Design a protein around this nucleic acid. Structure first.
Ligand code: NA
Length: 347
DNA sequence: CGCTAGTA
DNA sequence: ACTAGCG
């Protein structure tokens, strides 16, 4: 994600307990719990041997949330964006490669190194997430599978006012324009909260505390949608954005070599990549649980043609998007693997 | 030396 | 998180 974003806006953080959100609703990036839970199932998941410990982990955190009168909303990732469509495949190659090395170093007899081999092949499927959805539904906890990246969905839930805060371990949520983000939360409730309005407390940020400029800075620093230019981190991006005055971000990027006193000429693909990154942060498709339909994260502005934003997610029928959101329809095979109906969050 | 990027 | 390497 955004490289060390937390350390740059340290002064906008505040240590809290989840009791602060008693009688309210918060959205949870369930992946951060699912992963940690799946760590203790490394050899079991790699062996193909059944296990339900990550379920108990996620439900430990969820029950911890419920104990303080909080209404948690578990949000999961859905279809992979066309941008990261290949990087995922690479990660899969490395996955089953380390699975190969794992099963080979297991059969060798030395299971000592298998604790480094089998754990490098852990892969969060959608059946595991679905198990978590079942367990959470057996407690009255609403779930929501994002059409694509969970970050966008969470950001929408927070922006709309459906949830008041977001529990996650990813700093990219701030780039999506979230208001309140709860980070580093443990199994008790202790975590660092970062509020958007508090962004101005950071002196090293300058006038780059507004949503748009902050986003531009996060992108220029280096994100998952676009790698940063050589020698360009958070400090550099914040610097050039502070020294910039021209509303046209394209001209600023083209003149990045002037403001930083560096020898940096912008590749043609970097400009387009920046435009696509910005448009991905702005208009990635999310699921509106109230209207039960597929909408962009933000409403399209005046100078944007939605026909060009296929990389930000493809549109499908609202019924199918609903079946995906409920976790009924499989992400890959589009088969009906469940039959849940919220009429027998989705009010 | 402030800052980045690779290592842990 | 620690720090060599470099503007
Ligand atoms: Na960078």
């Amino acid at each position: 994600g955004i490289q060390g974003l937390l350390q740059f806006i340290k002064e906008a953080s505040e240590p809290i307990h989840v009791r602060k959100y008693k009688g309210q609703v918060v959205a949870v990036d369930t992946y951060c719990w699912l992963h940690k839970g799946a760590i203790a199932c490394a050899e079991k998941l790699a062996k193909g041997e059944p296990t339900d410990r990550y379920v108990g982990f996620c439900m430990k955190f969820v029950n911890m949330l419920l104990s303080h009168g909080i209404k948690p909303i578990l949000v999961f990732d859905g279809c992979t964006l066309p941008s990261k469509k290949e990087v995922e495949r690479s990660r899969r190659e490395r996955r089953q490669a380390n699975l190969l090395k794992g099963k080979q170093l297991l059969r060798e007899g030395k299971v000592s190194e298998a604790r480094e081999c089998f754990t490098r092949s852990i892969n969060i499927t959608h059946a595991m997430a679905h198990k978590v959805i079942k367990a959470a539904r057996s407690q009255g906890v609403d779930c929501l599978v994002a059409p694509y990246e969970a970050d966008a969905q969470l950001a929408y839930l927070n922006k709309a006012g459906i949830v008041q805060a977001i529990i996650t371990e990813d700093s990219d949520l701030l780039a999506f324009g979230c208001k309140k983000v709860i980070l580093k939360m443990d199994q008790f409730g202790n975590g660092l909260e970062i509020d958007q309005a508090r962004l101005g407390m950071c002196r090293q940020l300058g006038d780059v505390f507004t949503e748009e400029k902050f986003r531009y800075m996060c992108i220029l620093s280096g994100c998952d949608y676009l790698s940063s230019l050589r020698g360009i981190g958070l400090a550099k991006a914040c610097k050039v954005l502070r020294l910039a005055n021209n509303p046209d971000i394209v001209k600023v990027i083209k003149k990045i070599g002037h403001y930083l006193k560096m020898n940096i000429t912008v590749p043609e693909d970097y400009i387009n990549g920046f435009i696509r990154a910005n448009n991905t942060f702005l208009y990635q498709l999310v699921f509106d649980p109230i209207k039960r339909k597929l909408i962009p994260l933000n409403a399209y502005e005046d100078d944007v043609d939605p026909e060009t934003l296929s990389y930000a997610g493809q549109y499908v029928d609202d019924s199918i998007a609903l079946q995906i959101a409920l976790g009924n329809k499989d992400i890959n095979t589009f088969e009906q693997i469940d039959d849940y109906n919220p009429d027998t969050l989705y009010f």
